[PDB]
Amino acid sequence: VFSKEQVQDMYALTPMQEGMLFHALLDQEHNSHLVQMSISLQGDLDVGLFTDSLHVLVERYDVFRTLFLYEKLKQPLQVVLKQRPIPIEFYDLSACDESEKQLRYTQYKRADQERTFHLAKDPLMRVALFQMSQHDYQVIWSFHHILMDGWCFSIIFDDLLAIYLSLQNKTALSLEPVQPYSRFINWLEKQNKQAALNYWSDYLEAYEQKTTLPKKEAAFAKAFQPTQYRFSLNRTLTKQLGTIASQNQVTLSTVIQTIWGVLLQKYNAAHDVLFGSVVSGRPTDIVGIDKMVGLFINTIPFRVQAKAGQTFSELLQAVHKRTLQSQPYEHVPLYDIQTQSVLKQELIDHLLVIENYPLVEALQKKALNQQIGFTITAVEMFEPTNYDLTVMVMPKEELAFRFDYNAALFDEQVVQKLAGHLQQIADCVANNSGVELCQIPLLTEAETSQLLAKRTETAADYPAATMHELFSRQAEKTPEQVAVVFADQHLTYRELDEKSNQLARFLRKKGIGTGSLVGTLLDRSLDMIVGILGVLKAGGAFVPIDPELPAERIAYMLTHSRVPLVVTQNHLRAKVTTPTETIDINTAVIGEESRAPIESLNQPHDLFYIIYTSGTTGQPKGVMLEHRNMANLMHFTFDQTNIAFHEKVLQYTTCSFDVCYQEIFSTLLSGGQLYLITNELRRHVEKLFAFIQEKQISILSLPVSFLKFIFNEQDYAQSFPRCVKHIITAGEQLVVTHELQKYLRQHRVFLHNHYGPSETHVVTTCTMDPGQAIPELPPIGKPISNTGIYILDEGLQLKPEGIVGELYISGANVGRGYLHQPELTAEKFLDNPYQPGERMYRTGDLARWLPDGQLEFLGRIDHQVKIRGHRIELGEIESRLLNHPAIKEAVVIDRADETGGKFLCAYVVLQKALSDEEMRAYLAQALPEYMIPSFFVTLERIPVTPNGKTDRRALPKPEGDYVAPTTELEQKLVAIWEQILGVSPIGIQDHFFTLGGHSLKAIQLISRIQKECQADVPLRVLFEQPTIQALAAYVE
């Protein structure tokens, strides 16, 4: 029975015991919180004196007689009892079968690892002795994490052996007074809390984007399965890292931490990465703290940030200084430091731990120092472990690493590769201290050669003839067939050839040719295809212009092109205000030119085709293809596409955009028939689909906005043509709606998705979908014949599969450069660094290799949103909006306030009016609150360029969060919330951590609840549903 006499003391919990009490209260899938030192002793051991010495050890240390009381208190307490013996079970197995003994022992030992301590009701140690022979004993000694840092066991076992020796030799205890843990508590209360929180809020200040490592899978279940991998660096590489450290004025722990820093950088995009570092937390200010038994070990954020020009030595200095500046404050609990950060939680998700002295070895050396009758012959330890990953490092003779990781979340190949990269970094750093962080490669030869093989595979041999020579060699095959039809008028291939020969013979009289270029401001007509092919046969490059362009833009394009000659219809002659010769394509003299084939007089290597892009330059700039570039595409398109040959293709893309010519040459050189359609008819879907179905068009090509939106125009989408077999699309991150899903699934149309900068060609990768199954965000697929594709970092270094980087494109598709403003060209176009002799174009796109060998697109490098610590795929929010039955067409953009603070917003067009919440809930079904748009704008129409891309410029500026009503019903929790949080009135649907709560105040909350009412609710509830309404499931 209890009596008040028995309590020695009470205390408030120290921050570490506060954190570990929270942790122990959180989990119940296991409560493995434990350590199980398992020590093998041979020789002679008086179990009676061992028992006595354990009882004297528990009497000596107040921390072993501590119990933690929290059930109803304002604040957790340590209560220390004056007397509290620990269990000492003893099992003499010396009379048991060697076959039984090891089994019985193992069964017990594994059962003990399951026997959870109750932090109040039970003593927080156990000991068990198994006597296995006349001279063989095995000890199991489980204890709770909350009692002490596991390494403290080296002290406790030393005291225990000293006591045992004193009892065996009947000699007075020599032990010094216990350095009482209350001495540290006093120092923690002496220290100024706010000065340290005001330092850690500064340390984390600019932390824009969270660190990651490539987690295999989402948390579909808590299938946690503790797993390990381990490796070590060679003798020489380790002492080389020691030489680097001792030359740079930093610890070896700093070199190891910087190597892991650079690794996390290269594995992310970032120049600024943060991970957990575990520090002893013992403030050197305390007298005798290196003998103080208790709980000190602390987790601090560790941040490595680099400038682009920074040498590794210059990162060493900076991370060293940042470590010294942190040392005064490393006692602050991470639960408060997290509250100082815009990442209010999940600031850290893996640890790097450095331990110069493991407990084994250190313990395994001890009893060798005393003459007692037994020798400790082996030792083991066990520690259930928190994080999904933890990199232990032991600076042994050979610098040894171990990745404790949850193999439910990291594939073994991921970790194996990660250790390969971690050794390759370490070797690069170790050879030159002064290499730039950009110039350190992660990849071993086995990965380098495997990635480069994707250029050498899918090489192909082609005749590489000129594009009009390919037409001529096709036209001789079936000249009598109808090649092109426009309105209700058509040309045969023969007539197209003859008219092109005539026009080319005429145009050569103007001096057009290899040294020359021709402007083709022609509106859509049969004359347009004849015009193009004739200018091609004239051997100069053709420069098309959309009549619908601004006249100022037309005149700019003409004058910047230095074009001498422009081909137009009569009415367009007023458009050419420039001092340039203007040719009527109808001029009857062309009828007098010799209609037989004109000779081929320019070669496949030469310039071919130029169009003007948008960009960051206020001037549009002209990108120019060589004939070899299109010829290379044609042979691939024939060899490796499911597009049928003798087929009817709808031309759609306007001549200002290269997919127009993907239509034209792919149709003609496949011998198909071009169905042209009048300019404005692109505006009349009710007429487009009528034409397509009534003309029974078999092949179409559609901009990405047409796929997103027009298939949600229910009246017309339910009337969509079904004669089509194949669709081509390019230009924007492709999205397939639930409607487009249902249509493709029913009609089994083959959809082809193509990608390319246009500066090579808008096809240089592709994928195609049989309509059997379709991802919501399809990949951009495989590279194509004689195209090399590389994901590089800013150093032009390859980077491993599954990692994002700059999508460099190489091979026969790479254009010559820019027609004018050629000074930009050397920035974008360069030789393939890994293989001179191929041109390469620096696309502004990020991409990632998928393990299956498809290529993933991640949008422009300029638009990596990284809202409030998190990256966001705007296509996911677009997918969710476009799959809402009420939404026909929608866009999402990173807007910003007039201070420059970025925010998400959505621009939406709907079949009905609905409230903001009637879509916001539809997002909250699936999207985290970092990636639901802050505002929704309703529009009549999304702005599109005639190329079909959405335009960020024409959408209106926004006008005018978690905020919630005080829909009170019972204030009881609100009063509890208000009294604990203090900072604000509390909304009934409001979020405890958004209100500024944190892990420990949650236990203060629940402990208040379970006294202010006869109520209880498991702590996980407040993390599953961090709201007052969450407890509606628990009030009754």
Binding site: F2, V7, K121, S253, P328
Partner: protein
């Protein structure tokens, strides 16, 4: 420094470490630094490893090496001494004839007390302890203290032979009464000494102006006098213990401390006191507003030796009180019966020296450190004696730093800092409990003169305050233990209270003190109260919750 080089050598293992080689370049870490510092402190040098790491070169860290113990300045010191709070109180109280406000004792030595020996001892005493040299100049009509050097005239000395008079006691009484009038505070010795010869042995009179001495300072002065006389009788060089931090530096550090925000953190407590003390009052038998010391009378009450031993040994344990807590709770009950007031305020003299400046050691420092603070005793709930003693126990523990702060705020903190503090509650009543007399009779080499006269250290001393000085406190209550008995002294002014009312008050005290000693000795258990446990702000409403939860859990 060579020692630090030697530690680096025999900790980092590398030999021949240069004078400015780098700790991290030599392979140090968070552990080699600990090994250096632990090793280094064996030479009594201290160095926080924060400095060893941050200044990782021998030439740069040596600038942060310190001695583990400061050597307090044992030299001769002089000059301006700022008033301490109790000195400022004294000058602000502005007595008539301030040159006669003293403490004293009469020593006796059977075998004689030869003048030259005791003179040489007092000489060394005043050379050693500096504060006994001060003078108080009244410059510009303010006051400033000058600590004099050894410029001669350390103390006045007189010698007499009383054998010509049979009534030696009357002669020595009248002569010591004479000497008390002679403190030239502006210019002269503040220590007066007289030796009276008699056939039965020599008697030695010491008198010292109270501005420079204190009871602890008397214990020091006596045991130093004993060891000095032992040296003089042995003929060895008179050589007193190492001088602790001199009063000048205490005054300086106090003036510096008086403006720290640390002290101001106490300000809401003393405000919460004064804002409740506003209507505190004490009745008088006659309406009068000043008295002279000749009007004061005192009376004594005693407990028996058995009850005194019970109070000293057994009455504490039942509540973990200390002696002061019981005497003061009894004083509360006494006033609760006698005055029938709802509340009363009592002023207590702490010994000062409250470790306020960590580098300050005053264990051997002569001065007037007596620190005065008010306390409010609650009298509303006297019925459960089990709880009244608990309540009084806890209030005595809520006082910060045992009350040294309050008179700094009244006298030394710069008046913008000291907030709303009104300082206009005055010591109508004061209580103090001395130890045993053993500070006087501390040693056998000499003892208290049987002709002690009116010259005691305590407030029962007749001669040491000038008869014309104003009575600054109406009730002065002091306890002491002598003859194995507790003696309580009540001092009152005959013009403010009449004899019957103090006989009432003193019996209503003895009654409740014996009631408390019985009650707390009979209680055989032990109880404890929130101040025992080391939980900040724990309360009766909470400690008995925790002891309920443990009783339910186990």
């Amino acid at each position: 420094e060579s020692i630090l080089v030697s530690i680096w050598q025999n900790v980092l293992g590398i030999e021949k470490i240069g004078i400015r080689d780098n700790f991290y370049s030599l392979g140090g870490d968070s552990i080699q630094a600990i090994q250096v510092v632990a090793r280094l402190h064996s030479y009594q040098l201290k160095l926080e490893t924060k400095d060893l790491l941050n200044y990782p070169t021998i030439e740069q860290v040596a600038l942060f090496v310190k001695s583990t113990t400061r050597k307090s300045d044992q030299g001769i010191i002089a000059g301006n001494v700022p008033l301490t709070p109790i000195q400022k109180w004294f000058f602000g109280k502005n007595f008539t004839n301030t040159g006669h406000w003293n403490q004293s004792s009469v020593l006796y030595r059977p075998e004689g007390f030869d003048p030259k020996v005791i003179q040489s001892v007092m000489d060394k005493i005043i050379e050693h302890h500096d504060a006994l040299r001060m003078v108080y100049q009244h410059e510009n009509g303010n006051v400033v203290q000058h600590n004099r050097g050894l410029g001669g005239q350390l103390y006045d000395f007189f010698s007499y032979n009383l054998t010509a008079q049979p009534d030696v006691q009357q002669a020595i009484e009248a002569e010591t009464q004479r000497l008390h009038s002679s403190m030239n505070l502006q210019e002269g010795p503040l220590v007066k000494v007289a030796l009276f010869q008699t056939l039965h042995g020599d008697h030695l009179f010491l008198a010292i102006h109270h501005l420079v001495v204190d009871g602890i300072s008397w214990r020091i002065l006596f045991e130093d006098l004993a060891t000095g006389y032992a040296q003089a009788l042995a003929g060895q060089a008179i050589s007193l213990p190492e001088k602790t931090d001199s009063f000048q530096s205490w005054s300086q550090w106090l003036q510096e401390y008086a403006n720290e925000a640390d002290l101001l953190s106490e300000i809401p407590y003393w405000e919460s006191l004064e804002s409740q003390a506003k209507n505190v009052s004490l009745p008088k038998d006659y309406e009068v507003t000043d008295c002279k010391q000749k009007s004061v009378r005192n009376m004594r009450i005693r407990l028996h030796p058995e009850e005194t031993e019970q109070l000293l040994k057994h009455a504490n344990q039942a509540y973990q009180t200390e002696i002061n807590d019981l005497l003061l709770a009894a004083l509360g009950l006494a006033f609760a019966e006698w005055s029938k007031l709802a509340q009363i305020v009592i002023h207590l003299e702490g010994h000062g020296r409250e470790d306020i400046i960590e580098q300050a050691n005053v264990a051997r420092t002569v001065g007037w450190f007596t620190s005065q603070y008010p306390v409010l005793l609650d009298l509303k709930q006297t019925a459960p004696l089990s709880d009244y003693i608990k309540l009084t126990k806890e209030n005595m523990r809520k006082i910060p730093r045992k009350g040294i702060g309050y008179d700094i705020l009244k006298h030394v903190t710069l008046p913008e800092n000291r907030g709303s503090l009104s300082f206009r509650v005055q010591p109508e009543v004061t209580f103090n409990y001395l130890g045993q007399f053993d500070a006087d009779m501390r040693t056998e080499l000499f003892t208290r003169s049987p002709y002690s006269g009116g010259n005691t250290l305590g407030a029962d001393g007749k001669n040491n305050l000038s008869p014309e000085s104003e009575v600054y406190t109406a009730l002065n209550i002091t306890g002491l233990i002598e003859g194995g008995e507790l003696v309580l002294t009540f001092s009152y002014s005959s013009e403010q209270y009449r004899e019957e009312s103090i006989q009432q008050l003193s019996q209503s005290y003895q009654k409740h003190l014996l009631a408390i000693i019985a009650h707390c000795t009979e209680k055989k258990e032990v109880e404890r109260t929130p101040s025992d446990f080391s939980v900040k702000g724990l309360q009766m409403e909470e400690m008995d919750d925790i002891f309920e939860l443990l009783a339910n859990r186990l």
